[PDB]
Amino acid sequence: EIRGQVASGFGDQSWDASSFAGFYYDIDDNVSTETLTVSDLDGNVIPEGGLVYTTTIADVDFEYYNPDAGWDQYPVMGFFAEEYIPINPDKADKIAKLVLDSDDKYTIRTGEMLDLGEGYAIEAKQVDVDGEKVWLEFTKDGEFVDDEIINTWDVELDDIEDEDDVVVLKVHVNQVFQIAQIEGLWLIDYANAMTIESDDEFGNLDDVSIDGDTLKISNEDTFTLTRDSEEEIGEGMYFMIADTSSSDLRYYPYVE
Amino acid sequence: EIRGQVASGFGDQSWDASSFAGFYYDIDDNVSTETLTVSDLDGNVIPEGGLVYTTTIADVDFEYYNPDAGWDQYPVMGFFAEEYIPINPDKADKIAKLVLDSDDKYTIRTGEMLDLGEGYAIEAKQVDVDGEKVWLEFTKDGEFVDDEIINTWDVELDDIEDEDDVVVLKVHVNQVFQIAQIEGLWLIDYANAMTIESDDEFGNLDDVSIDGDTLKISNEDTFTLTRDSEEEIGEGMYFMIADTSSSDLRYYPYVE
């Protein structure tokens, strides 16, 4: 249980990352994307449309920052307190998990591998193209995906959540010795990507509105803040509502 | 990891329960007791005395509230994010854990027991004192502690953290049928009580000042907010400090 700030009385209330520790926040980039609002109370009853979760895409610099190499920003989005990466930086509805955002130095020997996590790997081999060159092979769980010959390599795949031209991997090479030096690795788990649709239900937040770079999700039925109780909002989010008389209302959101 | 609000820049900062979800907060009584302040930065170096944890006794109504029966308030105190109960409501340095604060109805048959948690129990028996009476026996892990004949029974023990006249148990009886009805049970784990002393060290908070109903604990050595790092404050409390240039300082406290 991670709580947010307590709300008092019968007026409106709003939570973001600063006031609710359960929301995604990234301190190095100073970025957050999520809000929860309660509006239009009739006593302790929130009316339809009155409980609203919102999330908006933000952009953050790659760990390996280098504008002169084409490494500027990548998109991020809180989705029910978990970091996700939109596969397209202007569209909130299609997202994947970040596997790596690194600026460390790795070395790959031409016989060798580099396990990137979650069955993603990159293999190096020696090739001839107008002389001796290094050949990097991006694989997944035992399957070819893409190649380049060797500074920024970008892997753009097709049919990722029904989209094309989607960068799932970035690799920057510092140097090659005669073994390669990587400094700049960025990868998303595109094989387990997901899509948010208008018809989706997320607990009692079951009215989904998709507005480009923003997702808004609200309640279709009235939501009652019953006193002396815990009530599910959805996806691990709850409210705790104090045991007071009906002369008061005191409650806070939490994540489990 | 439960984070508190982010601090920016080189000025002073202060956290309480509203701004730091890791601190103890009780929503039914709307009570909290803890603060963390950072003062007097020289760049990212906090000087001696500059990092200060404070906690002050608060009083909250018993779950079984009844001023006409002598059930008003009991003292509570956050101590490194955990609820403790001062054995004496005006003194912060001697504390125990709360086992029960109940207003539910229980029934004890004169042959029967009531397990209260942590090896504390109350046994009922039939006795004669000017006629048939109920005899309640408070025990602990297999050992007598106190008795009463039967509305509020209070058990006051000796040598609890070197103190006398200390209420460790309250029991209110609603009625007795010819089996007893309890409505009002309050118990502290007095066998595992503890004392805070001037000489104690709590991580880097190793200057302890005991001021009646308040505990103040600060740093004896300089505490450096090293960038791109996590630094222990003490007792599960840390700061996370962002990876920025020395032109900035951004950090937040968290509890593990």
UniProtKB/Swiss-Prot annotation, chains A, B:
It comes from the Archaea. Coiled coil: none annotated. Glycosylated. It is found in: Secreted, Cell wall, S-layer; Cell membrane. Glycans are attached at N30. Belongs to the Methanosarcinales S-layer protein family. S-layer protein. The S-layer is a paracrystalline mono-layered assembly of proteins which coat the surface of the cell. This is Major S-layer protein. It comes from Methanosarcina acetivorans (strain ATCC 35395 / DSM 2834 / JCM 12185 / C2A).
